Design a protein around this ligand. Structure first.
Ligand SMILES: *P(=O)(=O)O[C]C([C])([C])[C]([O])C(=O)[N][C][C]C(=O)[N][C][C]S[C]([C]S(=O)(=O)[N][C][C]1O[C](N2[C]=NC3=C([N])N=[C]N=C32)[C]([O])[C]1[O])[C]1[C][C][C][N]1
Ligand SMILES: [Mg+2]
Lengths: 478, 79
């Protein structure tokens, strides 16, 4: 019903042709291609024996060699994987499991139990993101989507078997699709960065050097941390030939501090897109042009995709080199999710089945390509993490003291500030800022915990909160 | 004196002056009082006020999780 996924065919060929080539590094451990593929086959056999076919398999695992083997094992058994960020609170992983309704959860215990003993499915994975109602929102990722992205990304970066790729992001996020799958496509090695290492600038710098990392893909926020650490320099990083940032803008002031930390000949790229498209717009930085740029362009749509800008009138303008207009970016082509797995989002419902996604990003077409201007809804990027303000609101409305709650945001250069505006129940003890942070700490990951509180007698509402009015009530009350 | 300087710095720089509920055991990063990306701003304050060298090549970042841990680290560096 589908072609064999190109990533699985490539992985099997590398285990056959170069069995002893390193596939994966994690802590002090490494696997060659034979060990990875053999382990994936052992796990696939167990899923086959459990009679799982065409099902969601949720990977409740830390970043590890075994978690990568489980990804491939789902595909080899006709199943799709549900990755999660193992660093977040257990109560949110429970909400994802409830939303995903997986046929099977692979956890540490399942691996322990295991060790003591015709492709019909078009879907490769479902990535559950922040949902505006609080309910996690599943983005279906097809084999077709991953193949399209990986073949484009290998060509763009000239990736080969000699490369050593970092894997910074959690498997829950689509950056990991390049780090793992582009590596497997070409027969390269990937360094799986563990949860304890993801923020640790000394451990990252030491690993870049130890493993001779040649290709790095992350959000700007960790690259700007590595710059500020003073630990990243062109000698420690001499193996780096490609750095890729994505997920949020890299302010040009900060990006000019990073470049002297990297080898001069290192290619630096800006990659753009939401989970629903993976990377769909890309720009390779010209260090000569960079001094004159006020913003780094996100660039041009990938070969094989098309774009439109939807103006303030709702009219869709086809993207051309000559267009000089700001509007909402709409992307079309094989990158686009077939749709959300578990919720209806009416804005996308007559777009996704026509291979179109409305990004929610306001963008400008310029002589240097597309430039990101801002979001137009209530989804915000916090250090490159996807946050629906409605998710945080849904949790705050459960606090015993709260009547109504709404968030607003202040944006700066590599900084965002979430502000909670709440009204209280009659007779309720007003919670303090630290009390509400402690309330949220059990429920949401740290980057969704707001850092300002404003208590008002009443939240502005319509015949739903009027968000236009929040900055003003914050101003008056401050 | 260092513990008090650090409590006042976090109250002033990160919490608009309010010490309400802030103490030496408050987990600064877990409660998003200090952005994970702003750790080097704390390191800089600590190095300046403590008058000990703090090389991030050799010093675990967990040492910045609380005021108590920052104070414990400076005690170890002052041999
Ligand atoms: P602390 O905060 O505890 O620690 C700091 C640290 C370690 C850096 C931490 O914050 C961290 O690891 N953060 C990274 C989180 C992460 O890995 N995110 C990856 C996903 S980003 C994106 C998918 S999305 O749907 O989540 N976002 C889409 C959305 O983002 C904006 N956007 C994307 N790309 C750009 C670019 N190039 N320029 C500006 N904005 C951009 C848009 O608003 C878009 O709609 C990935 C990115 C590539 C493919 N999808
Ligand atoms: Mg993602």
């Amino acid at each position: 019903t589908i072609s064999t996924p190109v990533i699985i065919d490539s992985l099997i060929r590398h285990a056959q042709r170069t069995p002893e080539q390193t596939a994966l590094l994690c802590g002090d451990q490494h696997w060659n291609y034979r060990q990875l593929v053999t382990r994936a086959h052992v796990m696939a056999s167990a899923l086959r024996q459990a009679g799982l076919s065409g099902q969601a398999i949720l990977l409740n695992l830390p970043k590890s060699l075994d978690a990568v083997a489980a990804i491939y094992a789902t595909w080899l058994s006709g199943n799709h994987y549900i990755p999660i960020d193992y660093s977040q609170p257990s109560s949110r992983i429970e909400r994802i499991i409830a939303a995903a309704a997986p046929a099977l959860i692979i956890d540490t215990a399942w691996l322990a139990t295991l060790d003591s003993q015709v492709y019909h499915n078009p879907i490769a994975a479902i990535l559950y993101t922040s949902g505006s109602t609080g309910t996690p929102k599943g983005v279906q990722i097809s084999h077709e989507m991953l193949g399209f992205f990986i073949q484009w990304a290998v060509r763009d970066t000239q990736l080969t078997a000699r490369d050593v790729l970092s894997n910074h992001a959690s498997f829950a996020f689509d950056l990991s699709t390049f780090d793992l799958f582009a590596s497997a496509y070409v027969g390269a090695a990937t360094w799986i960065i563990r949860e304890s290492e993801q923020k640790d600038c000394a451990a990252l710098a030491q690993g870049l050097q130890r493993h001779a990392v040649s290709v790095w893909y992350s959000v700007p926020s960790i690259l700007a941390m590595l710059e500020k650490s003073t630990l990243l320099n062109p000698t420690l990083g001499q193996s780096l030939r490609q750095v890729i940032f994505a997920g949020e803008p890299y302010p040009v002031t900060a990006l000019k501090r990073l470049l002297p930390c990297l080898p001069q000949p290192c290619r630096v790229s800006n990659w753009y897109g939401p989970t629903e498209t993976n990377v769909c717009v890309a720009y390779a930085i010209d260090r000569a042009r960079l001094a004159m740029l006020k913003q780094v362009p996100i660039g041009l749509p990938l070969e094989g995709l098309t774009a439109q800008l939807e103006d303030e009138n709702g009219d869709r303008h086809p993207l051309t080199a000559q267009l000089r207009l700001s509007g909402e970016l709409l992307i079309s082509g094989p990158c686009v999710t077939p749709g959300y797995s578990n919720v209806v989002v009416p804005r996308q419902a007559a777009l996704h089945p026509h291979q179109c996604h409305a990004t929610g990003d306001w963008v400008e077409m310029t002589p240097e390509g597309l430039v990101f201007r801002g979001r137009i809804d209530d989804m915000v990027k916090i250090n490159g993490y996807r946050v629906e303000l409605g998710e945080i609101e849904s949790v705050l409305h459960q606090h015993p003291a709260i009547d109504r709650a709404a968030l607003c945001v202040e944006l700066g250069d590599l900084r965002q500030t979430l502000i909670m505006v709440i009204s209280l129940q009659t007779g309720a003890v007003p919670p303090g800022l630290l009390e509400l942070k402690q309330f949220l700490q059990q429920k949401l990951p740290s980057y969704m915990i707001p850092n300002k509180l404003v208590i008002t007698e009443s939240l502005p509402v319509n015949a739903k909160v009027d968000r236009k009015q929040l900055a003003g009530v914050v101003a008056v009350l401050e | 004196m260092l513990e008090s300087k650090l409590i006042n710095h976090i109250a002033t720089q990160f919490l608009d002056g309010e010490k309400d509920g802030l103490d030496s055991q408050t987990p600064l990063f877990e409660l998003n009082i200090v952005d994970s990306a702003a750790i080097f701003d704390l390191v800089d304050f600590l190095r300046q006020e403590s008058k000990v060298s703090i090389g991030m090549q050799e010093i675990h970042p967990a040492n910045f999780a609380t005021v108590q841990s920052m104070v414990a680290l400076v005690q170890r560096l002052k041999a």
